[PDB]
Paper text:
TTR is mainly produced in the liver (90%), and it serves as a transporter of thyroxine hormone and vitamin A5,6. In its soluble form, TTR exists as a homotetramer in which the 127 amino acids in each monomer fold into a β-barrel structure formed by two β-sheets (β-strands D–A-G-H and β-strands C-B-E-F). TTR fibrillogenesis follows a downhill polymerization mechanism, in which dissociation of the TTR homotetramer and partial unfolding of the monomers initiate the amyloid aggregation cascade.
Here, we structurally characterized vitreous body fibrils from a patient with ATTRv Val30Met amyloidosis and showed that they are polymorphic and mainly consist of multi-protofilaments. The [name] fibril proteins in each protofilament had identical conformations related by a twofold symmetry axis (C2 symmetry) along the fibril long axis. The continuous Coulomb potential regions in each protofilament were modeled with two fragments of [name]—the N-terminal fragment comprising residues Pro11–Lys35 and the C-terminal fragment comprising residues Gly57–Thr123. In contrast, each fibril protein in the twisted-dimer has 11 β-strands (strands β1–β11). These structural changes convert the 3D barrel structure into an almost flat disc-like one. In vitreous body fibril protein, these residues form a long β-strand placed diagonally over the core of the fibril protein.
Numbering used by the authors:
A (entry chain J), B (entry chain H), C (entry chain F), D (entry chain D), E (entry chain B), F (entry chain L), ...: 11 to 35, 57 to 123
Write the structure that this text describes.
Amino acid sequence: PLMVKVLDAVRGSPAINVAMHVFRKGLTTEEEFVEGIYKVEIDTKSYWKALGISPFHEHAEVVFTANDSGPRRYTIAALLSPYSYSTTAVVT
Amino acid sequence: PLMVKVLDAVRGSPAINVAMHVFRKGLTTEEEFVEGIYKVEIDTKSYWKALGISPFHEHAEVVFTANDSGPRRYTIAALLSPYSYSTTAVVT
Amino acid sequence: PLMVKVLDAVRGSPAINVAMHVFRKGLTTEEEFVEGIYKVEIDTKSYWKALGISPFHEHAEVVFTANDSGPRRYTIAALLSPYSYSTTAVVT
Amino acid sequence: PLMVKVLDAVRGSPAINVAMHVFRKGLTTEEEFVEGIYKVEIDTKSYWKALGISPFHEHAEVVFTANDSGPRRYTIAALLSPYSYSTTAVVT
Amino acid sequence: PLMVKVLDAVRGSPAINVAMHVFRKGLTTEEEFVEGIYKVEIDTKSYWKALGISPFHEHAEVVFTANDSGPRRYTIAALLSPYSYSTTAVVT
Amino acid sequence: PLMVKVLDAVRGSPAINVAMHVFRKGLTTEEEFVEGIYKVEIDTKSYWKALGISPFHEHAEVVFTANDSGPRRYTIAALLSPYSYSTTAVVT
Amino acid sequence: PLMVKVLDAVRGSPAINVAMHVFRKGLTTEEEFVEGIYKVEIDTKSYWKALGISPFHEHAEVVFTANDSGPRRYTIAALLSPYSYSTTAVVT
Amino acid sequence: PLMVKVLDAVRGSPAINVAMHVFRKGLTTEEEFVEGIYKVEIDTKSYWKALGISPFHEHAEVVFTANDSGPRRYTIAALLSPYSYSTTAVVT
Amino acid sequence: PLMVKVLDAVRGSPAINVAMHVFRKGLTTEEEFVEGIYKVEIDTKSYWKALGISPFHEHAEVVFTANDSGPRRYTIAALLSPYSYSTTAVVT
Amino acid sequence: PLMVKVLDAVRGSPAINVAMHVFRKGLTTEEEFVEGIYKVEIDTKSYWKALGISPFHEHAEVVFTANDSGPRRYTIAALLSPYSYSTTAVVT
Amino acid sequence: PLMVKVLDAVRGSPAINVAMHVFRKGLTTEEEFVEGIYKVEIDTKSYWKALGISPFHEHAEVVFTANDSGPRRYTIAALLSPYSYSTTAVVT
Amino acid sequence: PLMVKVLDAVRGSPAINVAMHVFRKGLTTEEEFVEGIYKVEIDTKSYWKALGISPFHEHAEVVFTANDSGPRRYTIAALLSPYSYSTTAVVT
Amino acid sequence: PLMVKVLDAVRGSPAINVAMHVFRKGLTTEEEFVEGIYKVEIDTKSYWKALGISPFHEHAEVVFTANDSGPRRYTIAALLSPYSYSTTAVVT
Amino acid sequence: PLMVKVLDAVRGSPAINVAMHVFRKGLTTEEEFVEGIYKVEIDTKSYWKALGISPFHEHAEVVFTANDSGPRRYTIAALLSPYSYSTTAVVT
């Protein structure tokens, strides 16, 4: 007799971010990547990746180089932040 | 007797972001990538990726180079943020 | 006796972003990419990707180079953010 | 006895983005790409991609080069953001 | 006894974006690409792609070069954002 | 006789971030990456990764170099912080 | 006879971040990475990682170098901090 | 006052093999082959020869195969052997 | 006052093999082959020869195979052997 | 006052093999091969020869195979052996 | 006042093998091979020879195999052996 | 006042083997091979030779294999042995 | 006043082997091989030889195998042995 | 006033083996091999040899194996042994 009641009545003007779910029940490589409900990626970097069985097995000569420079100003505000009657401002 | 009641009545002007889902139930490589409900990717980078069984198996000579520069100003506001009666501003 | 009631009555002028779904019940390579409900990709980059069984198996000589420069100003506001009675402004 | 009731009555002028779906039930390569409901891609880039069984198997000599420059100003507002009675403005 | 009731009555002038679906139940390469419901791609780029079984199998010498420059100003507003009684403006 | 009642009635204008989910029930490599409900990644970096059985097994000569410079000013505010009647400001 | 009642009635304007979930019940490598409910990663770095069985097994000569410099000013405020009637300000 | 006197007088019937000589005094490839005085080549073989600057410079894939069989009976006698009053015989 | 006197007088029938000589005094490849006075080559073989500057410089994949079989009976007699009053015989 | 007197007078029938000489006085590859006076080569073999500057410089994959079989009976007699009044015989 | 007198007078029938001579006086590879006076090579073999500056410089993978079998009966007599009044015989 | 007198007079039938001589006076590789006067090589073998500057410099993987079998009966007699009035015999 | 007198007079039939000579006077690799007067090589073997500066400098993996079997019966007699009035015999 | 008198007169039939000579006078590798007057090598073996500067400098993994079997009957007689009036016999 499952039952879920969220936010059954709302008099007013909220700022809601609702997420949910109700559940009721030889050689091989694999990359499973299952994502979620909310996500905010900014400037994500995944430079190098070698995935599998026996990569670079013999005599592999790998030269990696990742120089990072440059003034990266992330002036951020109100991420995943539902607001009400509020004043979000970004100035420069 | 499953039952889900979300936001059954809303008097007013809310800023909602609803997401849900109710459930009731030889050699091989594989890349499964199943996505979610909400997503905001900005400047995501995945430079290099070797996926499979035995890549670069023998004598692989890999030279990688990722120089990153340049002033990247991310002046961001109100991501995944449903707002009400509010004032979001970005100035420069 | 499954039952879902979302937002059954709405007196007013909201800003809603609803997403849902109710469910009731030899050599080989594969790239499955199943997407979701919402998505906002901006300047996404996937430079290099070698996917499969035994790529670059022998004597592979790979020279990679990714220089990144240039002032990329992302002046962003109100992504996936349904708003009501509000004032979103971007100025330069 | 499945049943879904979303937004059964709406007195007013809302800005809704509804998406749903109710469910009730030798050598080989494959690229399945199933898309979803909503999507907003801007300046997406997928430079290089080698997909299959044994690409570049022998003596492969690959020289990659991706220089990125140039001031790319993304002045964006109100993506996937149904708004009501609001004022969205972009100035330069 | 499936049943779906969305937006059964609407007194007013809403800006709706409704999408739904209800469902009730030797060598080989393949590229399946099944698309979604609402979509907005802008400046999407997929420069290179080699898909199949054993491409570039032997002695493949591949020289890639992607220089990107030029000030690309994306001044965007109201994507997938049904609005009501609102004022969307873009100035330069 | 499961039962969940969250936020059953809301008189007022709250700034809520709700997330929930109720549950009721030879050689091999694998990378499972299942994501959560909320996430805000900014400037995440995963430079190098070698995942699988016996990578770099013999005589592997790997030279890594990651120089990091450049004044990165992250001037951030109100991440995953739903606020009400408030004033969030970022100035430079 | 499970039962959960959170925030059953809210008269007022609260900034709450409610995240909950009720539960009621040969060679091999594996990387499981299951994520949680909330997360805010900023400038996370995972430079080098070599998970697997017998990586670098013989004669591996690895030279690593990670120089870190550059004045990174993280001027941050109000992370995962839902506030009400407050005043969050960042100035430079 | 050079002077050479060979075999100045010969009373008799000699079998002579006389040979003499008295002497008194950018990119480029070259094969000089100056021969001498006497020579008896039999079944000489020079199967393969790549002569020059940078032959087979790149990706050259050369498959060579020289099977040698067959009963080659060289029943030889009196090569470069001037005889006198003698009896040379070859029988089978 | 050079002077050479060989075999100045010969009473009789000799079997002579006389040979004499009196002397009195950018990129580039070269094969000089100057021969001698007497020579008897039989079944000489020079199967494979790469001569020059930088042959097979890159990725050269050379498969060589020289099987040698077959009863080769060299029944030889009196090579470069001037004889007199003698009896040279070869029988089978 | 150089003087050379060999075999000045020969009464009789000798089997002589006389040989004499009196003497009185950027990138580059080279194969000089100067031969002499007498030579008897039989079944000489020079299977493989890479001569020059930087042959097989990179990634060279060379597979060599020289199987030698077959009864090779060299029944030889009187090589470079001037004989007199003698009896040289080869029987089978 | 040089002077050489060899075999000035020969009464009789000798088997002589006379040899003599009187003397009176950037990147680069080179193979000089100067031969002498007498030589009898039989079944000489020089299977493999890499000659030059930096052959096989990088990643060279060389597989050599020289199986030698087969009854090789060298029944030889009187090599470089001038004989007189003698009896040289080879029987089988 | 140099003077050389060898074998000035020979009454009789000798078997001589005379050999004599009177004398009176950047990167680089080189193979000088100067030969002498007499030589009898039989079944000489020089299987493998890497002669030069930095051959096989990096990651060279060399597999050598020289199996030797087969009854090789060298039944030899009278090599470089000038004989007189003698009886040289080889029987099988 | 040099002077050499060898074998000035020979009454008889000697078996002589005379060999005499009168004398009166950046990176680099080199193989000088100057030979002598007499030489009898039989079944000489020089299997492997890496001659030069820094061969096999890095990560060289060399597998050598030499199996030597097979009844080799060297039934030899009278090498470099000039004989007179003698009887040399080889029987099987 | 140098003077050498060897064997000035020989009445008889001697088996002599005479050998004489009268004398009266940056990085680098080198193999000088000067030979003598007489030499009889039989079944000489020089299996493995790395002569040079810094061979196998780093991580060299060398596996050597020399199995020696096979009856090798060296039934030899009269090497470098000039004999007179004698009887040399080899029987099997």
